[PDB]
Amino acid sequence: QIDYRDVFIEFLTTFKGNNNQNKYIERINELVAYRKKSLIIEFSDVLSFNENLAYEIINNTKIILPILEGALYDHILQLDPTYQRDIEKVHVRIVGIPRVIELRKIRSTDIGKLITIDGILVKVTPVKERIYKATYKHIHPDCMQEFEWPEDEEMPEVLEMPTICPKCGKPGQFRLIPEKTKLIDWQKAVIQERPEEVPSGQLPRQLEIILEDDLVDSARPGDRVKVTGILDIKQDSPVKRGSRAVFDIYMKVSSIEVSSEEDEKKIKDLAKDPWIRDRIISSIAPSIYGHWELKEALALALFGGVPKVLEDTRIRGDIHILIIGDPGTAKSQMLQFISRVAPRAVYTTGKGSTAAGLTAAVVREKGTGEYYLEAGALVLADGGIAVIDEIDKMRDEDRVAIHEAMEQQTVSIAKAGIVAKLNARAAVIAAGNPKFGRYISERPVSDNINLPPTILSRFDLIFILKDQPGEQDRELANYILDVHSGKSTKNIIDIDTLRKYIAYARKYVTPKITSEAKNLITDFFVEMRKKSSETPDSPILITPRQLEALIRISEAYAKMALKAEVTREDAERAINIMRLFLESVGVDM
Amino acid sequence: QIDYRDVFIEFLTTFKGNNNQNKYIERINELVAYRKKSLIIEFSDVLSFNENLAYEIINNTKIILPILEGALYDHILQLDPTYQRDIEKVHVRIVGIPRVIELRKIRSTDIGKLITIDGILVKVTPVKERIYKATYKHIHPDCMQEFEWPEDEEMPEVLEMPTICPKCGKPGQFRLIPEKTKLIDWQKAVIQERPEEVPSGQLPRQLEIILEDDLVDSARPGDRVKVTGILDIKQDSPVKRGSRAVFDIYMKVSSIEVSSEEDEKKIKDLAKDPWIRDRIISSIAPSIYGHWELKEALALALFGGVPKVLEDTRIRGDIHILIIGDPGTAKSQMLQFISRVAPRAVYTTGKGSTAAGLTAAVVREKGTGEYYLEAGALVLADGGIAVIDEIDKMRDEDRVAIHEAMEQQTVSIAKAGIVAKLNARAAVIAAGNPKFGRYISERPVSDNINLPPTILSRFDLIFILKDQPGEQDRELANYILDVHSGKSTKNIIDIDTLRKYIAYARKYVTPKITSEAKNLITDFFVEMRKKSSETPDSPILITPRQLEALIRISEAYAKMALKAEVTREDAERAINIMRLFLESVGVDM
DNA sequence: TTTTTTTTTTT
Ligand SMILES: [Mg+2]
Ligand SMILES: [Mg+2]
Ligand SMILES: [Zn+2]
Ligand SMILES: [Zn+2]
């Protein structure tokens, strides 16, 4: 019963963070500048400042938020009167709730309480409008009266029409007036539990969440998010009894977090090391012995090149890697590691995927009867990495559907009266086996690969892996047994901070090509083309695409060290890595 | 007539266990400490204590269970007052009901009586909420009153709305109030009769069961369960009568069990025998003469290895066995025995299965038109054993769908806008015939097996069975006729005990590799690679997977004797069994 | 009819 608005104001105005700069007065300072009508407050901060205040938000969230939000609005008005007539209400979002519940463990006792759920966003609906205060006209020749139907109460989830006119007391028919109705933004989304918490032999479960007002379009499908809000039962057709007094539960989101300053200096400290590139390479798949050249190639694909957008066309900035090897060469283990360290990645297999599922699917809604597009794997991976294991097992008629997405980075659909074009700017990493399971050194490269030259030319680097039992078996066996014994390699960058390093580099680094790097790349390309003409029967063709691979690889090397330009050292590395690629496919220089 | 609450309370406090330890008193505090809010009792113990109490439960179940619930709740509160305000209702479940009825023999006379049914779970729905006490607000300009609609009575299965407002006596509009409504967890499951109970030439029958409150998520599909509760008729769509006074039936589950301390003593006593490993092997398929190396191999697959989960990757712990042999070599008979003895096994046929059915299928839901996922055979066998008979009869383009699930133990689907990953951690045992039906000694091994090297490397052990007539025919003929004569081999562990032994071993034993075992395994693997390179023509490749096979087999041998360490003795056995596998495929050592 | 994944018969 004690007043908390005064406690809120002093907490907001007076608070000391770890940085010791009064974090919480800068957020409200930016609140009036950009007019976002939403404030983020950490539960750890309010708990430290006032234990009693933190509890009251947890257990009395229903009747403490409108009071608390009203106090904040008055303080905002005092700071700047211009906020009036621009924003009517300001929302306060609380994050970091200790009450975290697994999606499968939700029971009846959790209804009506503020909880937090971690999951994967799979579906988003277009933004719509919801009525919370309607206006009606009594169509009865004596009334012609206007009244807001739900008095001193917002309109419930199910729309209800008045039966007795409050202005005359007589029944009849009522007409809604849209221009006098108050609306609010409304969006529906579906949250799926993470594969980590799925029990054995069970399919994952899904939960429906509702986003309103400024929370709409705050995330995209495939993201990993944490949602805080209140659970409630869902009503769809209350008019039809139809027995079965059983309801499903939904969630009203109060705040959403999508998966800080101390990370910047931590990343900058790593880049200061002159051997940062070697540290990153050594940190790729620490459980795999050897394969140093493959680890270097996979590191480049994670960073990628610099895309170019021009007046008339655009140039692909992503790097594609293809690996062919004998079974048991740990090709899949490295691909699994890539899908974990990448900030955004989609893992698919050759046999378990279709052309429609990879790019886009045209699906007909049974109710409406209209066709609409469904995002494929490549579309969902835009701006990230796409992994296609067992690519050689895909049907050739089905594999050609990704030819344009791999180079033009677009998906074109002309089906069922729908013509559309979707961006698919995603790097592709693929693995497969030779034609006869294992590579045969007694036969040419032409029949060993068994892939059309069109798709091969789209890959920047192609590595052929040969399992040759030699003198390294003892070293390999010792390394494997140490892994099984729990021994772990040291002096490596862990997966969590490595993911942050890649995300920062891909966002704030854009290397430029210098004059000295141009000469080295130009000379190598001329020699590469001349050497290729010696053998025309090989299925590997040196096209102008290979020249752009040199540029992309060179930029990726500079981006690893957070450099602002491509020097001659990066060009030398780019030439060296492709020399190994050419040697593997049988081209010697 | 008389009150049994005093008898019930003293029954728990005065009952004596097997060794006079009062096996009910220590359950009460466990319920209090863990707040499990559910207590189970045994009918035979109740019958052994007081015959009158047992009859009243078995007959007047609908009027004595709430009475015993109240007495139990009072006894908990006095034992620990803190139990209040956390659990407002405690359920008591009775098991071991003598009234057992087959699913196909249910008649109208059994309706409303406490009965027990044994069957197989097939379908489970997501957990929902059911209203048992609602709150309404009369939307009439004069009432604005809130009341609980069902007075002194639970809300029936049909959602019924008040017609006359009790607070004012007038009809009108009533609005449900979810905040004041009381809910209860609700789940729906389908149970199927056992295959051995189905009459000749008919499909198995199914029954619908309802699980509520703590009984939700009590089992997974494919389990064998025993459900006890009251039968009742199902009212689904009573809005329109449409004649047809015929109704279905459903069961309200009161207690459920799936598929003990006495068994642990028996299991531990068996492991004390030094020759337990040989005793266990002799118990595998007692009706099959010979094939000692195959029985030993099948025993290892039942126990398996130790899966390793690291911060960046995970290692398969299951063991895969492949058998190729001439027809009539009892391959199918031995595989059928494995399905019976394994705690969780799925039997499939190569011809009677498809790629979608083995791993996962995307099906368009008819009600909404939206695609969703259906678990395949491998997913349903997670944590168990998958048996694939006639693997050679599968289409090659269709058999490759299980390559990922057999090594990475995952299933990836990218179809119709659905991207998902599922765990398929199961062991695969497969059997098949050579290319020409029977093994041809003239031709090499490569054309006899007729399988790609990729799938062959996935199998830890491969055995080739040759039906060669010889001097052993008389011994085989005598053994078969003795089986047909009813004679049974003695000194073998029964199938029921063996299943319990395997389940205990797989849950509480995690062997570790010692230094001595590491040296023996490393030396053998190096020798294997050197020998394989000398003859680069065999269809078997010694990949690094073979090294991990030795580790998994070594752990399985230690796990068979409930040993916590892998001594040198287990390494020698693992090396010895692998030697026989190599000699079978013609790889001399 | 139409696109899609699936089991099935039959164009
Ligand atoms: Mg692989
Ligand atoms: Mg057979
Ligand atoms: Zn009126
Ligand atoms: Zn009333």
Author numbering:
A (entry chain B), B (entry chain C): 7 to 265, 275 to 604
Authors' own words:
To examine the mechanism of DNA translocation by the MCM hexameric helicase, we determined cryo-EM structures of a protein construct of the MCM protein from the archaeal organism Saccharolobus solfataricus (SsoMCM) in complex with the ATP analog ADP-BeF3, magnesium, and oligonucleotide. In attempting to reveal different aspects of DNA manipulation by the MCM helicase, cryo-EM structures were determined with three different oligonucleotides of different lengths and potential for secondary structure. Despite the differences of the oligonucleotides used for complex formation, each sample showed highly similar behavior with two distinct structural classes. The first class of structure is well-structured throughout and binds a very well-ordered segment of 11 nucleotides of ssDNA within the central channel at the ATPase tier. The ATPase tier is not 6-fold symmetric because the subunits form a helical “staircase” that binds encircled ssDNA. The sixth ATPase domain (red) interacts with ssDNA at the at the bottom of the staircase with just one hairpin. This subunit also loosely interacts with DNA at the top of the staircase. Specifically, transformation of class 1 with six subunits engaged to DNA to class 2 with five subunits engaged illustrates a dissociation of one subunit from DNA.
A six-subunit ATPase ring forms the central hub of the replication forks in all domains of life. This ring performs a helicase function to separate the two complementary DNA strands to be replicated and drives the replication machinery along the DNA. The helicase/ATPase rings of eukaryotes and archaea consist of six minichromosome maintenance (MCM) proteins. The MCM rings of archaeal organisms, such as Saccharolobus solfataricus, form a homohexameric ring.
